[PDB]
Design a protein around this ligand. Structure first.
Ligand SMILES: *[C@@H]1O[C@H](CO)[C@@H](O[C@@H]2O[C@H](CO)[C@@H](O)[C@H](O)[C@H]2NC(C)=O)[C@H](O)[C@H]1NC(C)=O
Ligand SMILES: *[C@@H]1O[C@H](CO)[C@@H](O[C@@H]2O[C@H](CO)[C@@H](O)[C@H](O)[C@H]2NC(C)=O)[C@H](O)[C@H]1NC(C)=O
Ligand SMILES: *[C@@H]1O[C@H](CO)[C@@H](O[C@@H]2O[C@H](CO)[C@@H](O)[C@H](O)[C@H]2NC(C)=O)[C@H](O)[C@H]1NC(C)=O
Ligand SMILES: *[C@@H]1O[C@H](CO)[C@@H](O[C@@H]2O[C@H](CO)[C@@H](O)[C@H](O)[C@H]2NC(C)=O)[C@H](O)[C@H]1NC(C)=O
Ligand SMILES: *[C@@H]1O[C@H](CO)[C@@H](O)[C@H](O)[C@H]1NC(C)=O
Ligand SMILES: *[C@@H]1O[C@H](CO)[C@@H](O)[C@H](O)[C@H]1NC(C)=O
Ligand SMILES: *[C@@H]1O[C@H](CO)[C@@H](O)[C@H](O)[C@H]1NC(C)=O
Ligand SMILES: *[C@@H]1O[C@H](CO)[C@@H](O)[C@H](O)[C@H]1NC(C)=O
Ligand SMILES: *[C@@H]1O[C@H](CO)[C@@H](O)[C@H](O)[C@H]1NC(C)=O
Ligand SMILES: *[C@@H]1O[C@H](CO)[C@@H](O)[C@H](O)[C@H]1NC(C)=O
Ligand SMILES: *[C@@H]1O[C@H](CO)[C@@H](O)[C@H](O)[C@H]1NC(C)=O
Ligand SMILES: *[C@@H]1O[C@H](CO)[C@@H](O)[C@H](O)[C@H]1NC(C)=O
Lengths: 371, 454
């Protein structure tokens, strides 16, 4: 009857917000006798005693989905790992709504890492859509990272197989170093201007300042970056005319957690419409066996169909994330955040503003040399 | 240093003999403050060992953890990876769920498993398939984790082969079992060797489905790794007698020898740490209210007592003990073969046919075939000296070659056979659908009766 819900240490009003979502979701899902409850956590920076409080409370509480919603960590941990591993020990899905790393989003490492947000590598897919925008074909891969970078490279070559063109050069290395000006010279000596860039904040900002001390900021140098490359001092260490991407309703935490709890509530009522109701055990004391219908619960969850949503028409893909979300295309027009494009499920719509390049005029540079 | 060795309850191993496993040993103890704490835990929830780490890392800064699990759960290894990443303490998963195969260990963790990787285990299994020339096969992978790298390694290893492996299209289970679309994939299966990639309970379900659909024939072989099979103490239903497995869970090379080898590796690392560095205790105070040198990248090619216990780049051993087992007629995992440093050891290289996998299952398509070398028909040549591989338009043969002129005992030399009647017999086996069983003659010529003695 009663169903407990775990909470996150972020702030105070989101708890009342999903209690309002509890009050609204029980009305629109029949007169079934289900009951909904909640369980709060405390303010701990490390996730160690946080996961200790989870296994003290939430395993015995028989929660159905823990929705981790703390992106702004004061340290550089960004680790929802131990609570996710504790829930996957009894095969319970965790909605990790903090970061967009593919090393978290791996189904090989993480068992039931089912959230509503996709990793940053999907932006590369949007970059494939950018290859449909300006109709450019000769591209050069440059990823500083290695863990998410190799999977982004795999899906990039998978989409690259469709056009049957190829990238001119792929580049993966070890971040943290600064003697990559030889790599900048190797990038200069290639006949493509598509600079596919993917790194962290400080590393991408440092290699871009190294490129700026190498004359890679002039006309024809086409730069294409993501969210981690426009954050912090990389926002400061960005030129005047670069094209970046942005989420829609990703930083909007309220609507995100709102339709997340709506997804969880309709999934719980959908499983209650289904048979073979098995509850996760109270594994804290004595119980060593695991909840066997975890992948059965994933078979329930991966076949979810929707028609309405607060942030938008949510839908799980083949990997359990959002199909073709609302995206923004930003242009840092003279150190000012100027939005120049949007992207719906299948198409890029520019606004009434112009598209200013870091080099010449507003028209696209013909960066394909005659060799 | 201070080392807490907590274990499970596998094979009813007592906690008392481990105290004298190191006590009278360690004659040249160069690290002085080295002690052992033998412990057992009757529950396998994460909370227990988390409490153990928090009260023993604070318990006078214990620097050593050796854990062995008796259950069949692989997420315990992920929890140990997290603990070794956070606490920065070298942890050695020994057996059971303590050293089960996960996807990719963390670079900032010092955890190790005493087993082989899935790439090495797939290499050993394809070495078995090369040594038995079972070139027609299939591949069944579920949504069990780590499948894309595994299928990729199989496809590249076929591409890295001189065989030309007949690989059927890979059967992929997208969701749970439905018996609507999975049955269509099972009907597409008509190869010999079935390669399954799932859990243990899902393996029992798929074997029961194949037994219900008649897909458990004598042609239909079954090779799974140790992670599918698991520990020896649980043998569920619907298993063919002859169930091929490769595991490192040796009951002969028991738990005490495993933890003594772990003690030897830890003393080798501590001796090299004292000969290289001064501050030997490196630990953390407590779990609540929150490094100098890494022992992960310190003891790479460690060798204790002449045992090749060197480390890989993925936390595995370079040469662990790989044991090939099958299921006998008495429902037990019978030990068959081992693996050397390079050569695959095959004690039962003469493959038994297993006419009876279950009660009412006869096999009547094994035809014993002997021949004599004739030039246009029976062309018997050597096997490859590099790869031990016949080209796949030939068939294998064996011969009881006697070594000496006086003795009668010899070897079974296996060689390649091509010719006309070779192709005739192969087209018969493609037509009559039997299994040819070729060997060579050792008595001599065709036939001659000497007083009712042919
Ligand atoms: C039903 O839900 C309520 C609300 O979560 C539970 O009441 C307690 O509320 C406080 C916050 O005021 C929190 O500590 C927990 O959410 C609840 N207590 C604890 C310690 O669990 C109430 O317990 C739930 N009832 C049941 C039995 O499920
Ligand atoms: C993405 O954003 C667009 C913004 O236009 C949303 O589309 C609107 O949705 C409302 C219903 O919520 C309807 O009036 C129309 O479907 C759209 N209106 C206009 C004027 O565009 C969309 O819901 C969002 N979701 C997706 C598809 O990601
Ligand atoms: C927003 O997505 C919609 C849905 O696909 C797009 O509408 C399609 O556009 C193509 C190309 O013009 C047409 O051939 C289809 O018939 C449209 N499908 C419909 C009617 O939904 C649309 O292109 C995207 N945004 C806009 C307004 O350009
Ligand atoms: C291990 O591989 C080597 C080469 O095939 C074999 O020789 C051993 O080499 C190691 C090197 O450290 C020596 O310590 C041993 O004394 C050698 N043993 C012998 C008898 O030669 C060895 O045969 C292989 N091991 C096995 C199990 O066969
Ligand atoms: C990279 O290395 C070369 C050779 O040491 C050096 O000349 C160059 O300045 C370095 N680039 C930077 C600025 O890191
Ligand atoms: C770029 O080239 C111009 C002209 O040669 C030169 O004045 C300028 O200093 C260069 N900038 C750098 C630091 O790359
Ligand atoms: C999300 O957007 C709504 C307005 O639609 C706003 O009230 C709310 O504060 C936003 N959430 C946050 C915390 O950004
Ligand atoms: C419940 O499980 C049984 C097998 O025990 C199965 O036959 C049945 O279809 C399942 N029902 C549903 C739809 O949950
Ligand atoms: C066995 O179970 C008891 C239950 O209290 C527990 O205290 C103990 O740690 C377990 N381990 C041993 C000593 O077998
Ligand atoms: C591996 O063993 C060799 C020979 O003892 C020696 O170089 C060293 O111990 C190991 N390798 C290195 C360079 O660490
Ligand atoms: C064959 O002869 C050799 C040399 O005398 C001897 O070593 C070997 O044991 C003999 N084999 C048998 C089994 O008689
Ligand atoms: C003894 O056996 C060898 C083959 O091993 C054969 O070549 C030889 O002819 C035999 N001895 C005699 C004298 O026949």
């Amino acid at each position: 009857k009663i169903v407990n819900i775990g909470a996150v240490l972020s702030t105070r009003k989101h708890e009342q917000m999903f209690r309002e979502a509890v009050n609204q979701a029980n009305k629109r899902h029949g007169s079934w006798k289900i009951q909904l409850n909640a369980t709060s956590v405390t303010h701990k920076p490390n996730a160690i005693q946080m996961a200790l409080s989870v296994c003290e409370d939430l395993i015995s509480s028989q929660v159905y989905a823990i929705l981790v919603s703390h992106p702004p960590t004061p340290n550089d941990h960004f680790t929802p790992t131990p609570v996710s591993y504790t829930a996957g020990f009894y095969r319970i899905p965790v909605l990790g709504l903090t970061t967009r790393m593919s090393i978290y989003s791996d189904k090989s490492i993480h068992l039931s890492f089912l959230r509503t947000v996709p990793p940053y590598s999907h932006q590369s897919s949007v970059w494939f859509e950018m290859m449909r925008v300006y109709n450019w074909n000769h591209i050069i891969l440059l990823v500083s990272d290695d863990h998410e970078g190799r999977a982004a490279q795999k899906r990039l070559e998978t989409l690259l197989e469709e056009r049957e063109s190829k990238a001119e050069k792929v580049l993966q290395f070890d971040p943290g170093t600064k003697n990559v000006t030889a790599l900048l010279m190797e990038a200069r000596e290639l006949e493509a201007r598509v600079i596919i860039l993917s790194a962290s904040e400080d590393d991408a900002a440092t290699v871009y300042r190294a490129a700026a001390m190498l004359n890679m900021t002039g006309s024809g140098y086409v730069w294409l970056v993501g969210e981690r490359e426009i954050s912090g001092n990389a926002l400061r260490y960005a030129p005047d005319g670069i094209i970046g991407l942005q989420l829609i309703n990703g930083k909007n935490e309220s609507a995100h957690i709102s339709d997340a709890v709506g997804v969880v509530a309709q999934a719980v009522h959908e499983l209650l419409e289904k048979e073979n109701i098995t509850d996760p055990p109270r594994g804290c004391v004595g119980n060593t066996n695991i909840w066997k219908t975890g992948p059965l619960f994933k078979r329930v969850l991966m076949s979810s169909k929707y028609a309405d949503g607060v942030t938008g028409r949510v839908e799980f893909n083949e990997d359990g994330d959002r199909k073709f979300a609302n995206y923004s295309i930003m242009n840092l027009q003279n150190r000012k955040l100027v939005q120049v494009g949007i992207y719906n499920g299948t198409h890029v719509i520019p606004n009434d503003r112009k598209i200013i390049w870091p080099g010449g005029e507003t028209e696209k540079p013909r960066g394909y040399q005659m060799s | 240093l201070n080392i807490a060795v907590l274990l499970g309850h596998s094979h009813d191993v007592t906690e008392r003999e481990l105290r004298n496993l190191w006590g009278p040993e360690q004659a040249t103890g160069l690290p002085l403050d080295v002690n052992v704490v033998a412990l057992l835990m009757n529950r396998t929830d994460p909370k227990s060992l988390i409490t153990h780490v928090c009260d023993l890392m604070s318990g006078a800064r214990i620097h050593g953890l050796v854990f062995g699990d008796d259950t069949d759960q692989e997420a315990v290894a992920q929890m140990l990876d997290f603990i070794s990443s956070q606490t920065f303490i070298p942890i050695l998963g020994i057996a059971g769920g303590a050293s089960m195969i996960m996807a990719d260990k963390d670079p900032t963790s010092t955890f190790f498993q005493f087993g082989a990787s899935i790439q090495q285990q797939a290499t050993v299994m394809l070495k078995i398939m090369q040594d038995y020339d079972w070139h027609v096969f299939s591949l069944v992978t579920t949504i069990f984790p780590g499948y894309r790298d595994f299928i990729s390694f199989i496809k590249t290893t076929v591409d890295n082969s001189f065989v030309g492996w007949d690989m059927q299209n890979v059967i992929t289970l997208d969701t749970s079992f439905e018996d609507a679309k999975t049955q269509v994939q099972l009907k597409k299966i008509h190869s010999s060797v079935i390669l399954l990639y799932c859990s243990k309970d899902e393996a029992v379900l798929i074997l029961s489905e194949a037994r219900s659909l008649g897909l458990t024939g004598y042609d239909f072989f079954w090779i799974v790794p140790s992670l599918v099979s698991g520990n020896t103490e649980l043998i569920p239903k619907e298993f063919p007698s002859g169930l091929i497995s490769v595991s490192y869970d040796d009951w002969d090379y028991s738990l005490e020898a495993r933890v003594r080898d772990g003690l030897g590796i830890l003393t080798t690392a501590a001796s090299s740490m004292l000969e290289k560095f001064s501050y030997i205790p490196e630990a953390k105070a407590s779990c609540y209210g929150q490094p100098l040198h890494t022992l992960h990248q310190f003891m790479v090619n460690v060798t204790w007592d002449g045992k090749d216990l060197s480390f890989t780049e993925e936390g595995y051993q370079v040469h662990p003990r790989l044991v090939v087992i099958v299921l006998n007629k008495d429902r037990e995992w019978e030990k068959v073969g081992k693996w050397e440093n390079q050569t695959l050891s095959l004690r039962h290289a003469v493959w038994p046919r297993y006419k009876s996998f279950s009660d009412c299952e006869p096999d009547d398509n094994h035809l014993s075939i002997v021949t004599l070398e004739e030039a246009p028909f029976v062309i018997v040549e050597d096997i490859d000296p590099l790869t031990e591989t016949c080209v796949r338009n030939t068939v294998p043969c064996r011969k009881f070659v006697k070594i000496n002129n006086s003795t009668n005992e010899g070897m079974n030399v296996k060689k390649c056979c091509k010719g006309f009647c070779i192709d005739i017999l192969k087209k018969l086996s493609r037509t009559v659908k039997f299994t040819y069983d070729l060997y060579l003659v050792t008595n001599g010529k065709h036939g001659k009766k000497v007083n009712n003695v042919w």
